[PDB]
Design a protein around this nucleic acid. Structure first.
Ligand SMILES: [Mg+2]
Ligand SMILES: [Mg+2]
Ligand SMILES: [Mg+2]
Ligand SMILES: [Mg+2]
Ligand SMILES: [Mg+2]
Ligand SMILES: [Mg+2]
Ligand SMILES: [Mg+2]
Ligand SMILES: [Mg+2]
Ligand SMILES: [Mg+2]
Ligand SMILES: [Mg+2]
Ligand SMILES: [Mg+2]
Ligand SMILES: [Mg+2]
Ligand SMILES: [Mg+2]
Ligand SMILES: [Mg+2]
Ligand SMILES: [Mg+2]
Ligand SMILES: [Mg+2]
Ligand SMILES: [Mg+2]
Ligand SMILES: [Mg+2]
Ligand SMILES: [Mg+2]
Lengths: 106, 62, 129, 49, 62
RNA sequence: UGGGUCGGGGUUUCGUACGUAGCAGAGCAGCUCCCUCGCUGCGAUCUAUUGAAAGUCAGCCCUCGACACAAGGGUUUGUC
RNA sequence: GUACCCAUAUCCGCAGCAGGUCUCCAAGGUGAACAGCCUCUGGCAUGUUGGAACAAUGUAGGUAAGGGAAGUCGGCAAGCCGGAUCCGUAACUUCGGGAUAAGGAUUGGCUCUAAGGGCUGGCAGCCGACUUAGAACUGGUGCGGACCAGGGGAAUCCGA
């Protein structure tokens, strides 16, 4: 289960509660990176350009509250990193958010 | 003793809300600043939806 | 006795004169039975006697100092029962030094504090609270 | 926390007698305390020991 | 890896602005070998350097 | 009867979401079985769905619904 | 003589210095407008650095219940009105002004009605600009809904 991939619903409204207008989206992306660090555990985390667009879709001071993301921990195969494992974070679109829990996908 | 609000019609328990004594002599009870401002700015309780007067006029619950 | 109600009328307030003497407004110049603090305006509440002058009204009542009792205020003061209330405008009546009304009848409501402190003002019995 | 309360008063000779009042009232949770130790103190000319 | 010369030269070739020139990111090593306006024209005809359309300014609401 | 992240409730703030339907709508345009509220489309608002929708802890409350994690790490410290 | 900068980085100011330096071209929407605000052609990385937190003090910005100048040498600062349409405009005067004196009413949205033109033929037929006035309906009296933007009056002294 070292290469398993899961889906999560990160609450940005909780993590950017007190940052201020000009620093909401960068802090949100830093919080997504920290959430990946805490969930997967690999010090190397790469987020997708589609996820960046989904975060910056409403400007800087207006960040979507809940974001449904997908984390995939994959081996590096680059022989220049000590961890050799990196977490790719992608963004999946969803219309609703109620009754959505964290499940693993194949 | 629990009095009914003049604007919203809810029950004002002891220690809550305010009272307003007009120069004419009428004494109204306001539940909070929302209803206070709605009464001072001449808003219709029957036109405001969340009041009890609107529900009694439109037969919502009973 | 009288309790600590929210003082909302400092020195310099132009209140209405709710009586049939011939005075329109009263100008609060000081408060009876008060001790001041360095750079603190003597404030007045309800039922407390003050000294005042008539800025607009009868020429015979203008340009002279006379005692007055505040009967209505806009500053919401807490009743001992546990409710807050405030009137439409700041209004008071004129009296003598002993505490007797100068006019015959009063107009508008009268607060319970003033009505219980000064019996002669409640003797007119216009409207209580 | 704090919750106000309505209470009848007994003060005679006041404008509040036989009337209800609302007053601020604080609440503290005090579960039963378990006893563990016993300590003795002697009175020395320099204080307690 | 310095495409400043190519970005400046393709704009003058296409007779547009520097912001309207689009470079293929995967063929960066092939673009870097270009050093002439003829090479830039050849790459434009190929499809590695293209001209992006003008940003939409709708007049329907007007 | 470990903590954490989602989710579900409670509370709360604002005030009744988009869509749909209406023999509600100051009226307008097209058509004709010439039409006894004739049909169609447009038309600020209004009505039912609707005490609806939306946010609710990041310094709110409850959970044993679901996911992963955990005795994993570095430095230093004794009185014949 | 012909390159280049012509500038909050190629000039001067001891420098990649919020300073100074003469000219041409100049769009769309709102709006009277080259006002202010938002976009297109064209440029840019926020002006000699970034990460974490949001203590006091400070520099700019906005509100605050009741009183409204009672503070201060002083209404200093701040604050009120601020555009347009319709009525009404005082004392004085050199008769030109004062004057946007002062003081009042309206301002949104969607359907309408009426008026304001040109061209072809011996009174009829088509073509296109946005202006005004009135009325109906309607929104939780909100309507210059952002931006734009005269506080006023009574007098003294001086200087047309
Ligand atoms: Mg690398
Ligand atoms: Mg909405
Ligand atoms: Mg040249
Ligand atoms: Mg400079
Ligand atoms: Mg300059
Ligand atoms: Mg223009
Ligand atoms: Mg125009
Ligand atoms: Mg920078
Ligand atoms: Mg510079
Ligand atoms: Mg104030
Ligand atoms: Mg106020
Ligand atoms: Mg005033
Ligand atoms: Mg004064
Ligand atoms: Mg002085
Ligand atoms: Mg000033
Ligand atoms: Mg005069
Ligand atoms: Mg004048
Ligand atoms: Mg017409
Ligand atoms: Mg001069």
């Amino acid at each position: 289960n070292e290469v398993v991939t899961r889906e999560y619903t990160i609450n940005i409204h909780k993590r950017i509660h007190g940052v201020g207008f000009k620093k909401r989206a960068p802090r949100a992306l830093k919080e997504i990176r920290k959430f990946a660090m805490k969930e997967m555990g690999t010090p190397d985390v790469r987020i997708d350009t589609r996820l960046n667009k989904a975060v910056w879709a409403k400007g800087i001071r207006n960040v979507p509250y809940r974001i449904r993301v997908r984390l995939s921990r994959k081996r590096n195969e680059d022989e220049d990193s000590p961890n050799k494992l990196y977490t790719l974070v992608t963004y999946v679109p969803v219309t609703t958010f109620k009754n959505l829990q964290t499940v693993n996908v194949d | 003793k629990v009095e009914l609000c003049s604007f919203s019609g809810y029950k004002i328990y002891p220690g809550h809300g305010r009272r307003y004594a007009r120069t004419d002599g009428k004494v109204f009870q306001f539940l909070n600043a929302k209803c206070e401002s709605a009464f001072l700015s001449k808003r219709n309780p029957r036109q405001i939806n969340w009041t009890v007067l609107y529900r009694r006029k439109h037969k919502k619950g009973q | 006795a009288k309790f600590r109600i929210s003082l909302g009328l400092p020195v310099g307030a132009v209140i209405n004169c709710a009586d049939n003497t011939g005075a329109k407004n009263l100008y609060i110049i000081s408060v009876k039975g008060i001790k001041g603090r360095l750079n603190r305006l003597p404030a007045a509440g309800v039922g407390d006697m003050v000294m005042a002058t008539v800025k607009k009204g009868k020429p015979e009542l203008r340009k002279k100092v006379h005692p007055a009792v505040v009967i209505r205020q806009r500053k919401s003061y807490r009743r001992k029962d546990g409710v807050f209330l405030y009137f439409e405008d700041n209004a008071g009546v004129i009296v003598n030094n002993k505490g007797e009304m100068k006019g015959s009848a009063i107009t508008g409501p009268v607060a319970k504090e003033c009505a219980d402190l000064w019996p002669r003002i409640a003797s007119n019995a216009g409207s209580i609270a | 926390g704090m919750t106000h309360i309505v209470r009848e008063v007994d003060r005679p000779g006041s404008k509040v007698n036989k009337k209800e009042v609302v007053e601020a009232v604080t609440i503290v949770e005090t579960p039963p305390m378990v006893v563990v130790g016993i300590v003795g103190y002697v009175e020395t000319p320099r204080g307690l020991r | 890896s310095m495409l400043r010369l190519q970005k400046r030269l393709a704009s003058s070739v296409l007779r547009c602005g520097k912001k309207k020139v689009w470079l293929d990111p995967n063929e960066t090593n092939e673009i870097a070998n270009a050093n002439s306006r003829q090479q830039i024209r050849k790459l434009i005809k190929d499809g590695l350097i293209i001209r992006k359309p003008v940003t939409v300014h709708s007049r329907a609401r007007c």
